[PDB]
């Protein structure tokens, strides 16, 4: 599809069109501070092309927004290479939000979820988070309408044992939470429940095929999901492989190479040799 930069969208909705053809946002996505927006500015708006965010997803004080089901219906993985505090998902003082509707979100690699102070918000206790996040211990979901024991939640779907009773699991009235059988794990499955290929992440358009993943689990290179970048390719942004040249181009006007990774900075104990971008250990103490 497209890989675009981590964005910061505020005030006017107009800036939001910068995302229209994007499939992966390399970095984070932050949409915030829109005080004059109304329901009807969203009833015609969608980003079905966005499948993955590499860092974190963050929504804060966006008014008139009632569900995300039409905003990001097909976001499937959030990778959490960088986190906002400890969070890979932040839903905060999202006044007007009724329901989440990320019915396609299968996995949040790394981070935790913080969903707080969202009066109006239900369909939260109807989600089994343990099917999306590794560590849910540090989940922080309080002070939503859902905490008032008074929610009209309605969904067919499966029930999990999170509490002292099984609980039907769904996102909206018309979308169940997808659960893959236990041993498929993080790889995803078809509607029947045949496991997708083991190097795929959340979903696949076809079973048993590493070019037909919906979001690579390890690294992406040249169409396929792979275990690792072979040389002469370098690990980038902890999700995709590139050659020396790509990495170099970025650096010149602040990327460097070390451990076969392309990274912003040389790690401690190392200085940057000028001819080759390669971090080398220091001759005596490091001035840095």
């Amino acid at each position, epitope marked *: 599809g497209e890989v675009c930069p981590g964005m910061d969208i505020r005030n006017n909705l107009t800036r939001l069109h910068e995302l229209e053809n994007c499939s992966v946002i390399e970095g984070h996505l932050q949409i915030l501070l829109m005080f004059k927006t109304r329901p009807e500015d969203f009833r015609d708006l969608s980003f079905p092309k966005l499948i993955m965010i590499t860092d974190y997803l963050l929504l804060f004080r966006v008014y008139g927004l009632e569900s995300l089901k039409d905003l990001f219906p097909n976001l499937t993985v959030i990778r959490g290479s960088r986190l906002f505090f400890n969070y890979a998902l932040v839903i905060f003082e999202m006044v007007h939000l009724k329901e989440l509707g990320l019915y396609n979100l299968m996995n949040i690699t790394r981070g935790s979820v913080r969903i707080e102070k969202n009066n109006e918000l239900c369909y939260l206790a109807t989600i089994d988070w343990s099917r999306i996040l590794d560590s849910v211990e540090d989940n922080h979901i309080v002070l939503n309408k859902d905490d008032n024991e008074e929610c009209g939640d309605i969904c067919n779907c499966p029930a999990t044992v999170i509490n002292g009773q099984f609980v039907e699991r769904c996102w909206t009235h018309s979308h169940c939470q997808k659960v893959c059988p236990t041993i498929c794990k993080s790889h995803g499955c078809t509607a029947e429940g045949l496991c997708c290929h083991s190097e795929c992440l959340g979903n696949c358009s076809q079973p048993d095929d590493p070019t037909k993943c919906v979001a690579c689990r390890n690294f992406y290179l040249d*169409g396929r999901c792979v275990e690792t970048c072979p040389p002469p390719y370098y690990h980038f942004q902890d999700w995709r492989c590139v050659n020396f040249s790509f990495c170099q181009d970025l650096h010149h006007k602040q990327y460097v190479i070390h451990n076969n990774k392309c990274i912003p900075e040389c790690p401690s104990g190392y200085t940057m040799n000028s001819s080759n971008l390669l971090c080398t250990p220091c001759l005596g103490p490091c001035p840095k």
Partner: antibody
Amino acid sequence: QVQLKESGPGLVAPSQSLSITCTVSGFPLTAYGVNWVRQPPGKGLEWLGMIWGDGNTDYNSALKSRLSISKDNSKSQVFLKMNSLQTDDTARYYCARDPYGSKPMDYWGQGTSVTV
Amino acid sequence: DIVMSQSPSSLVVSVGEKVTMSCKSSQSLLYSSNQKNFLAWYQQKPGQSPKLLIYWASTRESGVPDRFTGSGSGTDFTLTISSVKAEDLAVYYCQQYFRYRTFGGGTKLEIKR
């Protein structure tokens, strides 16, 4: 349905060139690499070259410009082209798949006989 | 491209026993970024085209029985066949896939009767 089969001319007189077509099916050539390997009867297996998903090329330095590897991805074909052969080039020629990122050489052709 | 060397040129053994052949490279094959060695083992049952067996020098290919066991790290590698069954007879080769690809001279396995 991963399958490879090589098309050799079989018989080549010295000082003339070798053109082999590896025809693969079941996978996209835009997404995997392909290697060329030969074996003279009862001798070793010899790596000749590979062509990556992006058109990038690797040749054994043994082949001093003698080897050219190119492709037609829309028609699922890989072309090896090798100039001015001698009798020491009498061997069985294979292409084999290369899932570079994840695997090494999975799935081989049955191999085609080439004699100089 | 680097240089690979195997031993022996050929070996013989009878049914039931374990077998270990070796290989060596002119450069270290352990990939830093994931801690895996970029080496392969292939078996070629004779008359047929070879079959992939063991990659990252220890990862077993699906469809390979547990009796096949890969080892070694750095520049020096070994392949092990624990408990020989009848049609285990083949010539085995080592391949590096670190930079380009090159094969070893190979080593032949024969069976006693």
